[PDB]
Amino acid sequence: GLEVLFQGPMTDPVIVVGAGPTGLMLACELGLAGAPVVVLDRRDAPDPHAPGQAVNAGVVALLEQRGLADALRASGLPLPGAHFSLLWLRPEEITADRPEVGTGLLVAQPRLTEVLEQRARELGVDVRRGHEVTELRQSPGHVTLKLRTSAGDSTLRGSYVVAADGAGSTVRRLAGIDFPGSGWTVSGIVGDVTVDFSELAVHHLGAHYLPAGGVYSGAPAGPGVLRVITTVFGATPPAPSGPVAAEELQGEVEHLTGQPLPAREVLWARRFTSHSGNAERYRSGRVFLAGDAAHSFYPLGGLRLSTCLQDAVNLGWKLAADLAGWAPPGLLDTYHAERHPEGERARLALDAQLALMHPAARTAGARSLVADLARFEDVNRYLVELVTGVDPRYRVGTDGASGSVVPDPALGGRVPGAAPLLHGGGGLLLLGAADGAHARTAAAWADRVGVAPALAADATRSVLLRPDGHVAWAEGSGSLETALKNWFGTPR
């Protein structure tokens, strides 16, 4: 009982289950927007072995609009190249028109998580490690979680619960939400090996599709450390998961590339199995799914983390607007409406890439076809924009109407040049001279929408940005006033 004393007033927080990249990004968005939030995680400390290294332009864009990209870049190498099914593309052909496309990074996933965690701490977010969610019960007005710590069992009440608990999501299972997909289940080994980088043959650096039917990737992770991923397709692994010894990893490396690594020591190595899935719904009452809990697929490129952080940034401001009481009706429902098809589009894109790799003998013709088609400029642009995480566009109609049957193709995308203007959060109306009145209209929403010149964002007409950076209106797409109502609610 005594624990309740002296804590002061408290509003029912958004409970974020999981302190990976998804959870922490969402907690930063909630924190910035002034919503109450608690983050739980079953681990005692951050995972030093979090495996990702490819952080694409889609991720960087979201970091940039919160001023988090510089901290990540300090630990990263520019990764300007782009591939589809490990066929190399030509991103340089469109970077003049879309500079964003060249902002991807090679950077270890724990560095991203550290950047987000530090920002969450600055925004006052309480991150409760050693806390495992074991049960969930919804009520009309709140949710209650059962937790386990080394003390013992306890309860926590929130306004909302967001599953950011990874691909095997406890919460998704507790909510009884199905996770269908294509049946692509692909196994690999990931680990870190001590090397002298000068000793490496060129075929031990970078990511390679081996025509026999497998993938090898070697990328520097730190001083004298090579991060290695191997997958041998159609080979049933000795087991579907668990730790892996040097011999087994060296076995796969040599099988694929013809040669074992010049390895001093395998620091760590584990067998992973990726499932392909998209959750049938992203919302159930006051429970939401985000990141890997909502969608999973083999991590060939950077779409896992970009869909993760795109979910977090779509959801946070919407949860906060709902709690603050100004959200237009249906705002929370647009999370599923916008993110569910995007999870599916990414999941389906990995199915496409895998079907050009395995079974190798049978897929060679399709692979050669796509390689041929990728010589055309419009095909190259389509694939580059896909794999870099830059092509998502929400369906937004005239007057900013959500989920339109007649989407306006000028709306729902991004204004990359606006990122520095959005660090404070909130909506943003970019004002351009292209043909008084816009500023005047927007004044009634000045508590939710700031103003800046379109020219400070390299935009060439007036545009309205949601707090997630996506375009809800632009000059020529109907009424600004109706679009302000549709996304930001009733005038003050």
Ligand X SMILES: Cc1cc2nc3c(=O)[nH]c(=O)nc-3n(C[C@H](O)[C@H](O)[C@H](O)COP(=O)(O)OP(=O)(O)OC[C@H]3O[C@@H](n4cnc5c(N)ncnc54)[C@H](O)[C@@H]3O)c2cc1C
- The one-character DSSP state at 331 is T
The residue from 126, 196, 372, 458 that contacts its own copies (CB under 8 A) is: 372
To the nearest whole angstrom, how small is the minimum distance from the Cβ of residue 212 to its own copies? 14
Bridging pattern class, strands 263-275 and 185-195 = antiparallel
95-98: Cβ within 8 A, 24+ apart: 98/385, 98/390, 98/416
If one asks whether residue 304 binds ligand X (CB under 6 A), the answer comes out as yes
If one asks whether residue 316 binds ligand X (CB under 6 A), the answer comes out as no
- Residue 54 annotated as binding? yes
Rounded Cα gap, residues 277 and 342, in angstroms = 12
If one asks whether residue 373 binds its own copies (CB under 8 A), the answer comes out as yes
Q: Which does 355 bind (CB under 5 to 8 A by kind): its own copies, ligand X, none?
A: its own copies
**Ordered alpha helix ranges (H), 45-91:** 57-64, 69-73
Query: 166 in the Ramachandran plot: left (φ > 0), alpha (ψ -120 to 50) or beta?
Result: left
CB nearer to ligand X: give 308 or 457: 308
CB nearer to ligand X: give 165 or 192: 165
- Residue 109 annotated as binding? yes
Query: Residue 370 has which token pair?
Result: 């796509």
> What totals of helices (H) and strands (E) does the chain contain, helices first?
12, 26
Q: Note the residue count of the chain.
A: 492
**Single-letter amino acid, residue 345:** R
If one asks whether residue 369 binds its own copies (CB under 8 A), the answer comes out as yes
**Selection from 36, 77, 45 nearest residue 159 by Cα:** 36
Contact 400, 478 (CB under 8 A): yes
To the nearest whole angstrom, how small is the minimum distance from the Cβ of residue 214 to its own copies? 17
The residue from 337, 366, 410, 452 that contacts its own copies (CB under 8 A) is: 366
Burial zone of 479 (CB within 10 Å; 0-12 exposed, 13-18 middle, 19+ buried): middle
The residue from 63, 94, 300, 350 that contacts its own copies (CB under 8 A) is: 350
A 10 A CB-CB count for 330 gives: 11
Per-residue x/- mask for ligand X, residues 111 to 150, rule CB under 6 A?
---------------------xx-----------------
Rounded to whole angstroms, what are the CA distances from 412 to 49, 176, 348, 406, 472?
A: 36, 31, 21, 13, 6
- Residue 22 annotated as binding? yes
In the range 437-466, which residues lie near its own copies by CB under 8 A?
Answer: none
CB nearer to its own copies: give 147 or 370: 370
Q: Segment near its own copies (CB under 8 A), from 54-62, 74-82, 305-313, 346-354?
A: 346-354
To the nearest whole angstrom, how small is the minimum distance from the Cβ of residue 336 to ligand X? 17
CB nearer to ligand X: give 230 or 462: 230
Rounded Cα gap, residues 214 and 359, in angstroms = 9
If one asks whether residue 244 binds ligand X (CB under 6 A), the answer comes out as no
Q: Segment near ligand X (CB under 6 A), from 62-70, 163-171, 254-262, 343-351?
A: 163-171
Rounded Cα gap, residues 330 and 325, in angstroms = 13
Residue nearest to ligand X (CB): 20
Q: Which residues contact 478 (CB under 8 A, 6 or more apart)?
A: 398, 399, 400, 408
Q: Count how many Cα atoms sit within 13 Å of the Cα of residue 337 in the half-sphere of its side chain.
A: 15
CB nearer to its own copies: give 337 or 355: 355
To the nearest whole angstrom, how small is the minimum distance from the Cβ of residue 103 to ligand X? 14
Q: Which does 132 bind (CB under 5 to 8 A by kind): its own copies, ligand X, none?
A: ligand X
The residue from 29, 165, 385, 481 that contacts ligand X (CB under 6 A) is: 165
Q: What residues are designated binding site?
A: 22, 41, 53-54, 109, 133, 292, 305
Residues that bind its own copies (CB under 8 A): 182-184, 348-352, 354-356, 361-366, 368-370, 372-373, 376, 378-379, 382
> Residues interacting with ligand X, by CB under 6 A?
17-23, 40-43, 50-54, 109, 132-133, 164-166, 170, 190, 229, 272, 291-292, 299, 302, 304-305, 308
